[PDB]
Amino acid sequence: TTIAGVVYKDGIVLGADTRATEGMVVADKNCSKIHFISPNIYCCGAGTAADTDMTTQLISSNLELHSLTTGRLPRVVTANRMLKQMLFRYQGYIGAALVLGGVDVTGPHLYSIYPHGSTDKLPYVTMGSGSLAAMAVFEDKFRPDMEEEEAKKLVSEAIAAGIFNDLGSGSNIDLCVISKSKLDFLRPFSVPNKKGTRLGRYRCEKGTTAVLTEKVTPLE
Amino acid sequence: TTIMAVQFNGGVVLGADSRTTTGSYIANRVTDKLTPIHDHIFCCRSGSAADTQAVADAVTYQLGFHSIELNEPPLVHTAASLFKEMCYRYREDLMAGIIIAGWDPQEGGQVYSVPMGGMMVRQSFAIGGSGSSYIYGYVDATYREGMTKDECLQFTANALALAMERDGSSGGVIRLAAIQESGVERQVLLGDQIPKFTIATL
Amino acid sequence: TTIMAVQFNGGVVLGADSRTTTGSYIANRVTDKLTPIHDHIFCCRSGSAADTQAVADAVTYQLGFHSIELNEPPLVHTAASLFKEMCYRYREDLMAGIIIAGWDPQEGGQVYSVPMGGMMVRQSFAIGGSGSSYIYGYVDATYREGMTKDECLQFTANALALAMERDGSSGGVIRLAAIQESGVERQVLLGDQIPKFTIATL
Amino acid sequence: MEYLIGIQGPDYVLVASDRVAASNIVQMKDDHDKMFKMSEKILLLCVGEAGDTVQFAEYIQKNVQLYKMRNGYELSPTAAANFTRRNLADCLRSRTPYHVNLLLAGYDEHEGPALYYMDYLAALAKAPFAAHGYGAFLTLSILDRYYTPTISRERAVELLRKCLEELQKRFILNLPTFSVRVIDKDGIHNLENIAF
Amino acid sequence: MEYLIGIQGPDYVLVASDRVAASNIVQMKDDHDKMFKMSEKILLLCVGEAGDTVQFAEYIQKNVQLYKMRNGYELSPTAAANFTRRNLADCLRSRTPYHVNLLLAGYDEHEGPALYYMDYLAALAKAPFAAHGYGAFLTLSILDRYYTPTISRERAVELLRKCLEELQKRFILNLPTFSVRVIDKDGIHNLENIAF
Amino acid sequence: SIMSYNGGAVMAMKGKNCVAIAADRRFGIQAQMVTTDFQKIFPMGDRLYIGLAGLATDVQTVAQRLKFRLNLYELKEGRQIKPYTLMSMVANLLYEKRFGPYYTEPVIAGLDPKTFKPFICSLDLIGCPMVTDDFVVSGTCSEQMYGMCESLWEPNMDPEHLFETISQAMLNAVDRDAVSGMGVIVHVIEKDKITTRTLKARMD
Amino acid sequence: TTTLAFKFLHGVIVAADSRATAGAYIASQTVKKVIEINPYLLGTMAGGAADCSFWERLLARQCRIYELRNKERISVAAASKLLANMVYQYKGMGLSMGTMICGWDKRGPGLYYVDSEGNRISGTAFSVGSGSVYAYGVMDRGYSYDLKVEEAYDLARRAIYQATYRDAYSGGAVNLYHVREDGWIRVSSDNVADLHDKYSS
Amino acid sequence: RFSPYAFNGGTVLAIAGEDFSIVASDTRLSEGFSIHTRDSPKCYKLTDKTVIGCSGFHGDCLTLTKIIEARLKMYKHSNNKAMTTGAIAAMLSTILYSRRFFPYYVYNIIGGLDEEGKGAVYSFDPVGSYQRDSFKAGGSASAMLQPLLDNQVGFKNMQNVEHVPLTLDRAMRLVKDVFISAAERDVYTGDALRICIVTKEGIREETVPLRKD
Amino acid sequence: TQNPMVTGTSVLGVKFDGGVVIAADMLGSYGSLARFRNISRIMRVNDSTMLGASGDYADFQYLKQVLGQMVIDEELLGDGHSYSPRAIHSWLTRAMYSRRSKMNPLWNTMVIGGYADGESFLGYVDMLGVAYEAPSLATGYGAYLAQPLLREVLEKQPVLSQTEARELVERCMRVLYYRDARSYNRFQIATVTEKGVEIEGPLSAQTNWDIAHMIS
Numbered sequence A: 001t002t003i004a005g006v007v008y009k010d011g012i013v014l015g016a017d018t019r020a021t022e023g024m025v026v027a028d029k030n031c032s033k034i035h036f037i038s039p040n041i042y043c044c045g046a047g048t049a050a051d052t053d054m055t056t057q058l059i060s061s062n063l064e065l066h067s068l069t070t071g072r073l074p075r076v077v078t079a080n081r082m083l084k085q086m087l088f089r090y091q092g093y094i095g096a097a098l099v100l101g102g103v104d105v106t107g108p109h110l111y112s113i114y115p116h117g118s119t120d121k122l123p124y125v126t127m128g129s130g131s132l133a134a135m136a137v138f139e140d141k142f143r144p145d146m147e148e149e150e151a152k153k154l155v156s157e158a159i160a161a162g163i164f165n166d167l168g169s170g171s172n173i174d175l176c177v178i179s180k181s182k183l184d185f186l187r188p189f190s191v192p193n194k195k196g197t198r199l200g201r202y203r204c205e206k207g208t209t210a211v212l213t214e215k216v217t218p219l220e
Numbered sequence B, C: 001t002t003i004m005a006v007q008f009n010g011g012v013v014l015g016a017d018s019r020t021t022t023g024s025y026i027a028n029r030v031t032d033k034l035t036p037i038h039d040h041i042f043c044c045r046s047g048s049a050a051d052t053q054a055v056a057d058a059v060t061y062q063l064g065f066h067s068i069e070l071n072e073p074p075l076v077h078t079a080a081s082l083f084k085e086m087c088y089r090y091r092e093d094l095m096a097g098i099i100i101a102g103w104d105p106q107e108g109g110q111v112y113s114v115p116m117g118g119m120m121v122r123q124s125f126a127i128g129g130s131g132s133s134y135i136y137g138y139v140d141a142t143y144r145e146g147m148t149k150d151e152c153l154q155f156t157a158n159a160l161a162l163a164m165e166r167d168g169s170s171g172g173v174i175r176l177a178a179i180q181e182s183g184v185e186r187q188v189l190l191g192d193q194i195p196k197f198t199i200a201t202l
Numbered sequence D, E: 001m002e003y004l005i006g007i008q009g010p011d012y013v014l015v016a017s018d019r020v021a022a023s024n025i026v027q028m029k030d031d032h033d034k035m036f037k038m039s040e041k042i043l044l045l046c047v048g049e050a051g052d053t054v055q056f057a058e059y060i061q062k063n064v065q066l067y068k069m070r071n072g073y074e075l076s077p078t079a080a081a082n083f084t085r086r087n088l089a090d091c092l093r094s095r096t097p098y099h100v101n102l103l104l105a106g107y108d109e110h111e112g113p114a115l116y117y118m119d120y121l122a123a124l125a126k127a128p129f130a131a132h133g134y135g136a137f138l139t140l141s142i143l144d145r146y147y148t149p150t151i152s153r154e155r156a157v158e159l160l161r162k163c164l165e166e167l168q169k170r171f172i173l174n175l176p177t178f179s180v181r182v183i184d185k186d187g188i189h190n191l192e193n194i195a196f
Numbered sequence F: 001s002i003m004s005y006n007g008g009a010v011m012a013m014k015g016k017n018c019v020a021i022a023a024d025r026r027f028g029i030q031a032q033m034v035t036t037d038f039q040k041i042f043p044m045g046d047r048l049y050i051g052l053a054g055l056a057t058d059v060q061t062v063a064q065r066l067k068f069r070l071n072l073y074e075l076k077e078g079r080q081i082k083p084y085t086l087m088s089m090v091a092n093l094l095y096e097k098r099f100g101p102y103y104t105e106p107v108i109a110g111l112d113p114k115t116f117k118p119f120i121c122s123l124d125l126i127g128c129p130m131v132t133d134d135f136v137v138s139g140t141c142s143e144q145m146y147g148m149c150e151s152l153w154e155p156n157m158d159p160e161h162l163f164e165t166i167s168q169a170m171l172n173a174v175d176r177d178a179v180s181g182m183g184v185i186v187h188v189i190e191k192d193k194i195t196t197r198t199l200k201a202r203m204d
Numbered sequence G: 001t002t003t004l005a006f007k008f009l010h011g012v013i014v015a016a017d018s019r020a021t022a023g024a025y026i027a028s029q030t031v032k033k034v035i036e037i038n039p040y041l042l043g044t045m046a047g048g049a050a051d052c053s054f055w056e057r058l059l060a061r062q063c064r065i066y067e068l069r070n071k072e073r074i075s076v077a078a079a080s081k082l083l084a085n086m087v088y089q090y091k092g093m094g095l096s097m098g099t100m101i102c103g104w105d106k107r108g109p110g111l112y113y114v115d116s117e118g119n120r121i122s123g124t125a126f127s128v129g130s131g132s133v134y135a136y137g138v139m140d141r142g143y144s145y146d147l148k149v150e151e152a153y154d155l156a157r158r159a160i161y162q163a164t165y166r167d168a169y170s171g172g173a174v175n176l177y178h179v180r181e182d183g184w185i186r187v188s189s190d191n192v193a194d195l196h197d198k199y200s201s
Numbered sequence H: 001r002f003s004p005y006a007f008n009g010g011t012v013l014a015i016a017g018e019d020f021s022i023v024a025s026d027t028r029l030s031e032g033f034s035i036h037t038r039d040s041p042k043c044y045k046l047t048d049k050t051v052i053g054c055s056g057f058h059g060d061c062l063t064l065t066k067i068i069e070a071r072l073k074m075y076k077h078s079n080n081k082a083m084t085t086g087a088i089a090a091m092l093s094t095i096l097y098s099r100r101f102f103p104y105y106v107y108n109i110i111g112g113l114d115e116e117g118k119g120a121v122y123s124f125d126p127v128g129s130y131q132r133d134s135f136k137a138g139g140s141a142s143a144m145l146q147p148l149l150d151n152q153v154g155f156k157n158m159q160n161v162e163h164v165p166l167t168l169d170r171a172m173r174l175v176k177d178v179f180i181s182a183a184e185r186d187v188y189t190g191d192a193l194r195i196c197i198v199t200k201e202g203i204r205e206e207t208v209p210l211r212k213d
Numbered sequence I: 001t002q003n004p005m006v007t008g009t010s011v012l013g014v015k016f017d018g019g020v021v022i023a024a025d026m027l028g029s030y031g032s033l034a035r036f037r038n039i040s041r042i043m044r045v046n047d048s049t050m051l052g053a054s055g056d057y058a059d060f061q062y063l064k065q066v067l068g069q070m071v072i073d074e075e076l077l078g079d080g081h082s083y084s085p086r087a088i089h090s091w092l093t094r095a096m097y098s099r100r101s102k103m104n105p106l107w108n109t110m111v112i113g114g115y116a117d118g119e120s121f122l123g124y125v126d127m128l129g130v131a132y133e134a135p136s137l138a139t140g141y142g143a144y145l146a147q148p149l150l151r152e153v154l155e156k157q158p159v160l161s162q163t164e165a166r167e168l169v170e171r172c173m174r175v176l177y178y179r180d181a182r183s184y185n186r187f188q189i190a191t192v193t194e195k196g197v198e199i200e201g202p203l204s205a206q207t208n209w210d211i212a213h214m215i216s
């Protein structure tokens, strides 16, 4: 992975790449790493892919159960507490490096949560194998209270830095823009990488394979 | 880390660096290591970020309930005892080095050390963290019996500045907090504000 | 150990503790870690007692012959270079942290550090040994540009006393040596003579 | 080291196993039986660990017998093999894993002859012929060579004899006698023990 | 795994060894001769690790023959055994130690029949009867039971047969054939290979 | 490697209004082949299949425990299962054994009921879903299978062209793997019919 | 690998496969595992790919020098002894090679098995390799000293085929050599896939 | 202690035709999870008729190339002629086996012309085992390139296709396509593809960009 | 060297229109301790080439001595031939691999910069003998932090002026000080040009710490 998050003037902009790996091979060229927590809170994920999916779902489930009971909009701290305490209970055996971002009645909030259960409240955070490359962009170009399109540009450039400089990351850039007014889930925000057009013709013409046994079962 | 707490007549002064590491990489270069437990009780955290964080959260929960159940401002010793009970019980599982410093309307300014073993001892001033190793000599030579609040602020700021210079695991920003009956006042020392000690060789 | 050498105008000041440890037992409570190599050249020994000693004895032999053959009073840099060659070639076999300090008619007072790797660097002042860890903060806060010979003697004695106070593998007696054009003068500090920084707690 | 072999024809299943029970360098027993009667038409040939073999095979044996008493009829060879596999698979990740390599043979009322191969990891597979033990490495190629689905029982014994004679020639372990049994519509039949 | 046995009489030495060369689970050779002719009256029975057996035995063999050519007369059984021990014991703490367990059998013009036992560590020991390998454990007790110092060679082969039959009964490894040789005043005599 | 113990390879491919799922037929323990006709692809609901690759026990244990849950589902619900629903069920089953998993990476291929839409996915041993529009592979010759599919697969393929592609992709990949092969079975799933074919392959 | 060699009335049959593996990956299917030392002498390859190729080529050099110096062909015994001595010096170092040395000698048909472990044994029939256990079975069942020339060919051809069927690390094609008194001849190179077609009918 | 090896990725490919030989490689040099350089073509010329491609531990690849070049001149000085492709392939085997107990972590593929002007390819393992073949892949992505070539160039597993002789154009398209396919799945492969073409008149070079992620 | 002792962290390098610029902080770390705060980790080889070294400082001092003599030995002859930057790079690859193969590595990672005959040289050398040329180079944590930034700029603008390259390095050294825990805000800038090799005295990067107040 590369995942990043930033706090701008109006709210939070989250970023992620779309590569998943099995050993040293690309397993999924287009993967969803920005996860739904609540209508106002989203969470980026890095580390063990399955641990990222299930942890983020369980908390999304618990928060929905919480918001239905309270009758009010869930808080980012609640999501943070639920994630922090759970990951700590498992002593880091659940490999989930997370970037948590959302907008409350309190305002815009951004967190980085580690597999062991340590949380950092910061204006900009990076997690994953390409996090240092992404951080180099944040340390070079970040300014307080940026405009919406300026922040969209910054995070996408940070993820790109991870994509091109880290072997664990690649493919598309995903963004999620959260404000007090609007939620924008831009799945394919950028397609920097593309497969080369095929030149040779390798059409396996009909009847090129020898068959020993055939059975055709009709259906409804 | 480097963490530090000093005691004076009116109350206590607390100091911490802002660096947190994941190996050799600095994950957060501007951390708040001074964690409020109650109105007048703080703790300085060193060691495992996740371990110290969980203990602090649980103590805040316990003392919070304890203070309401007694209907009385909570004693610093009581807060420090709740740290002792957890740090000692889970000594094999936690990597925690806590300094508990605060004020209560019965004993005044108090600085308690709960190191990795889980023991508890009250001190005039305490130092902890990886960086504290490099300032024992300085701290032993500079400390004076009966320093004022302002003198304690400078004393703790100087020692940290010297620790962050030599220790790789320490650096960034000096965070200071003064506790007395009045309340809690916090300040932050940035770049140039850090006490300048010239690098002198040949 | 703790070892220290400070360069002043007309020469150098050397200082060491006197403790030799075999585990947690002091095998020798009054050790002369300041080893003479030539008339004006000394070295401070820390690490393996047998290793540093053997190197010292080989440099004395090597520099002895070199000086006679060259017909000059030997350069401190030259004596430091003989230590470097040995400490670098056999870095995997030796545990030696040497400070070479002395005087020569060409360059005056000089202090060279040869740590465990086998590198060589000239410094205004140098500290080494296990105890030197606890005095980095003090030494950086106290050191001033252009100290007199008598001040450097006080400076080394203070730093060492603080280090012996905290470090278990340091202690006993402070041994000081001053080297200038006129020659070498030695003094020893016992019990009361060691600068007392009182036990500072409640 | 122990040996199992199974040969399935059109209407029978031929099974054989060595009668040697060894400890380090000595042959403690000469007439050991590695075959367990489950039903009137099912045999379970169990091989592997010193304690696990008897404990596991016997546990399945009494359960099938309990089924016989419970319902009035017997389990099918297919159902038996799956029952054995379930009990082995469940124990695999537990505190007491059974290290047994087994072979189940049976004749069904409606389905006919059946032979099942099973790993100690509990991997079930149906085969026309199968073998266990180090001796399998020398014999399996002879089975691949001289086998047709339409093999008669008398020529299946000849094929089995070709395999056992190879164990006398190439196999370094002393295996003089073999238990031979056939299962068909009439049940389990004892055959003449092949000796050398 | 390999087996050696020697039985000394009043005027002869009877020696036997299995003819099996084994690779992990397969028998590669049916007629592996494990005896090496040193002189007209000396045999070296060599057993042990893969390459060490043939390399070490032949080195002593060719050196004993070199002694014959160099001086005209041959080495005595005692002289040969000590020569073999010296070469093994000097290699014991060297870069290349030979892992061989051996039996030396010979007839002397003065002292008569002699059988020598030698550890891979190079411990020489003269005995009336000796054995090597796992088979030794099952045979030395029989040798203890029926041996007399005045045993006739016809009754010695009968005693040898008892031991080899025990290997067919109790020993887990398949050793069908054995080499049998006698050394007396007239030299080395080949006997019929005992087969099972 | 625990996954390399039994070997095997399972592949799924997306067509026009159809999906294909193929697997090798070898059942072996390490170097030794045991059975030449082992079942790795299992029917889950007429127009939906699952192929399991990995340790032979876990292939069988998961297949049977999934059917256990699916039958209860299809009885509780008045409907037959949807492809996405099965994928989440499998992921659920595999994650329950997070810290001691079944050593099998499943592959699901089928058509969506009513909407007749094609669907393919692969999962982790701990159940991580990965949906694609082209192909999903799992097994010991993961790399070999990827190289074939990337260069052969085309956007819209009719059942016959899809069959030729998955067949050729499986055959040539398997032939560079020692622990895979001994025959390849292919299922082509259409709305009206299911075509099942065993291919002519090398047996070495 | 699977390799085999057996001697009979008409000569010495040498058979081998052509598969080479790097882990689970099949590196090659066209490896010549029988090396041609002399017009009358052969050597099979099994084990470490480079080890077998290097040391048996070293032997080919050794045998040629012997021929030039002594004006006479090397014996099968002497050719096997040289390789046994060369490979023994590297015992325990990691070399992995199981070879058969086949030829026609002054003593007649010659067959020796030489190991990197240090084994050197003469015999009538051997099978060397990972699939050797499977080739041993089918070879022994259909073997006779009185076998016709063509009958011995199909025996060796089937024995390798049966090994490739069970062994994962055996396959490709079955190559056959026949050692006669006037020298060896190259018999046939039959693909396993083509043999599967023939033996199924 | 200390590892004297590093895996630097990279894949080499060679196809032998009737009058030509193509030696192709990606240009990415990696270590751990980061890229050293995007410009590192692995194919290197030795004579007018021979091109070598090295993948694996770059330290060894650099050293080994410098050894071969020296040896080429040594042969040239002694025998008064350029070394033939087969002779280079035979020599490399001995150079690689010389380090049997301290192996070069190296996958070599030699491509060029033989003594009759036909295309020749030689594939190597780390310790010197080698053979002549028509096409081979070696490196981090060799398992991905090979099966497609076995199908298209080798006509394997297809029922009725008459074995049409390879053309330079079709082989060039095949090379480009397998590497594009490899760049999709193998993380070590990408950036750019370098292609060397050996014919009657010298050696030609061509470069096609690849995915940079 | 089996175990490094006093070590230097990142070394940076980027070529511009006119020459090459190399940067390295002046710290020698002893584990987590910053022991030697004032040491030069950049050396001038000759008029046309320079070197910056990461890792074990004692090993660097050895290479400094050996290269030092080599340049002296050439200037003795005065035959008009001198080592090119590419030649020193080639030699260093041979030295480092030789020691690696002896299983006694020189615990170093070098960056060679030079300017000769119009074109500028920038080369990398491992402790294993991995060597290559690149328009921008970074060792240690610089590889993970600085190099990404160096590549991004060269994507947009392949050729840089001395000023643009110099202020880029300023930006890279700032990030390294924020994120690498073994670095030090006191560095040297080394520059190869047609005029020769210049190394500049103690330099500090200006830092921002505004993000301290925006946590809450």
Ligand SMILES: *[C@@](C)(CO)[C@](*)(O)[C@H](Cc1ccccc1)NC(=O)[C@H](Cc1ccc(OC)cc1)NC(=O)[C@H](C)NC(=O)CN1CCOCC1
Binding pocket: A001, A002, A019, A020, A021, A022, A023, A027, A031, A032, A033, A045, A046, A047, A048, A049, A050, A052, A053, A095, A128, A129, A168, A169, F124, F125, F126, F128
């Ligand atoms: C980048 C790609 C790392 O290279 C990201 O961290 C990414 C996170 C992600 C991707 C998709 C969906 C949600 C989140 N991580 C991976 O792709 C991850 C790499 C990894 C492998 C093994 C690990 O050790 C525990 C940790 C990380 N890939 C996977 O999870 C893959 C699909 N699964 C496996 O490799 C199988 N594992 C599961 C964990 O236990 C060992 C076997």
Ligand SMILES: *[C@@](C)(CO)[C@](*)(O)[C@H](Cc1ccccc1)NC(=O)[C@H](Cc1ccc(OC)cc1)NC(=O)[C@H](C)NC(=O)CN1CCOCC1
Binding pocket: A114, A116, A118, B001, B002, B019, B020, B021, B022, B023, B027, B031, B032, B033, B045, B046, B047, B048, B049, B050, B052, B095, B129, B130, B169, B170
């Ligand atoms: C200084 C920086 C280092 O000694 C302080 O002690 C600091 C304390 C702190 C940090 C954040 C908030 C308040 C106070 N400690 C750390 O930064 C800490 C270092 C550490 C790591 C692991 C330990 O053993 C379990 C003990 C100390 N860093 C962290 O906890 C970071 C966020 N997490 C990791 O390093 C992850 N580890 C867990 C253990 O296994 C290796 C990976």
Ligand SMILES: *[C@@](C)(CO)[C@](*)(O)[C@H](Cc1ccccc1)NC(=O)[C@H](Cc1ccc(OC)cc1)NC(=O)[C@H](C)NC(=O)CN1CCOCC1
Binding pocket: C001, C002, C019, C020, C021, C022, C023, C027, C031, C032, C033, C045, C046, C047, C048, C049, C050, C052, C095, C129, C130, C169, C170
């Ligand atoms: C302080 C006391 C400890 O760091 C000094 O460095 C001191 C140096 C000194 C001592 C005498 C004269 C001049 C200077 N060090 C010691 O006292 C030293 C501690 C040490 C032991 C072993 C080491 O590894 C090689 C390094 C440091 N003590 C000794 O050398 C004593 C006399 N000998 C032993 O401890 C015997 N050892 C040798 C190593 O193997 C285990 C037994």
Ligand SMILES: *[C@@](C)(CO)[C@](*)(O)[C@H](Cc1ccccc1)NC(=O)[C@H](Cc1ccc(OC)cc1)NC(=O)[C@H](C)NC(=O)CN1CCOCC1
Binding pocket: G001, G002, G019, G020, G021, G022, G023, G027, G031, G033, G045, G046, G047, G048, G049, G050, G052, G053, G096, G129, G130, G169, G170, H125, H126, H127, H129
């Ligand atoms: C069958 C296929 C079983 O593997 C044969 O034994 C075959 C024999 C053969 C093949 C080609 C040429 C002549 C003879 N053996 C192999 O193909 C062999 C398997 C093997 C791997 C490693 C070994 O070392 C203990 C022994 C056997 N494959 C190889 O040698 C491959 C091509 N090369 C490597 O694996 C490289 N190794 C060599 C040893 O050091 C580590 C790297």
